[PDB]
Amino acid sequence: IRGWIFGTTLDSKTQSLLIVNNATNVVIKVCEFQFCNDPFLGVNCTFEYVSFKNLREFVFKNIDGYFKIYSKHTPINLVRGLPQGFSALEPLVDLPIGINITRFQTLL
Amino acid sequence: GNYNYLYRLFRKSNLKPFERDISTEIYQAGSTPCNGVKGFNCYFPLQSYG
Numbered sequence A: 001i002r003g004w005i006f007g008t009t010l011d012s013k014t015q016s017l018l019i020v021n022n023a024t025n026v027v028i029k030v031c032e033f034q035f036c037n038d039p040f041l042g043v044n045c046t047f048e049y050v051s052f053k054n055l056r057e058f059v060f061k062n063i064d065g066y067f068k069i070y071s072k073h074t075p076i077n078l079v080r081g082l083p084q085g086f087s088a089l090e091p092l093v094d095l096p097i098g099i100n101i102t103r104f105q106t107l108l
Numbered sequence B: 001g002n003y004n005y006l007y008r009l010f011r012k013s014n015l016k017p018f019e020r021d022i023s024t025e026i027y028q029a030g031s032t033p034c035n036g037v038k039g040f041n042c043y044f045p046l047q048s049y050g
């Protein structure tokens, strides 16, 4: 898993947000995009930003035109599903994206 | 008149706080689907102060 897309129509006549994770970099972008019918990662611009054995956890929420990201990392044993235990996610970013959101999709 | 400056006079629903929306689809003002053409109850949602 290496990115996400969020929006109302997700492409075409409305704005949407893209996130991509790129080995050492991260890229975040907003546009009236026209992505693929079946998106991929491997071998306009009205906002832009740049920077089993493990479980990565995230929360995405949109409030007052800001988009808030929280995250956590942990090692794990359980192969089947989310492990019984406890840790709390901590804030990464609070982005002034302004768009409306209704749908999302994972990139992998 | 200067027409570089525009305001939206019609929308489907009110903005959420700090919501931004640049979309330019034809506003359907009534019963009939507009399919991206102007007409009776089918309007461009932007206007200018001029």
Ligand SMILES: *[C@@H]1O[C@H](CO)[C@@H](O)[C@H](O)[C@H]1NC(C)=O
Residues within 6 Å of the ligand: A022, A023, A024, A025, A027
């Ligand atoms: C992806 O990361 C590589 C390695 O840092 C970098 O060369 C490349 O420019 C990044 N992609 C973008 C869109 O900048």
Ligand SMILES: *[C@@H]1O[C@H](CO)[C@@H](O)[C@H](O)[C@H]1NC(C)=O
Residues within 6 Å of the ligand: A008, A009, A100, A101, A102, B012, B013, B014, B015, B016
């Ligand atoms: C946000 O987008 C959805 C899907 O198009 C729409 O139903 C809703 O009315 C929009 N919300 C606002 C506050 O405009």
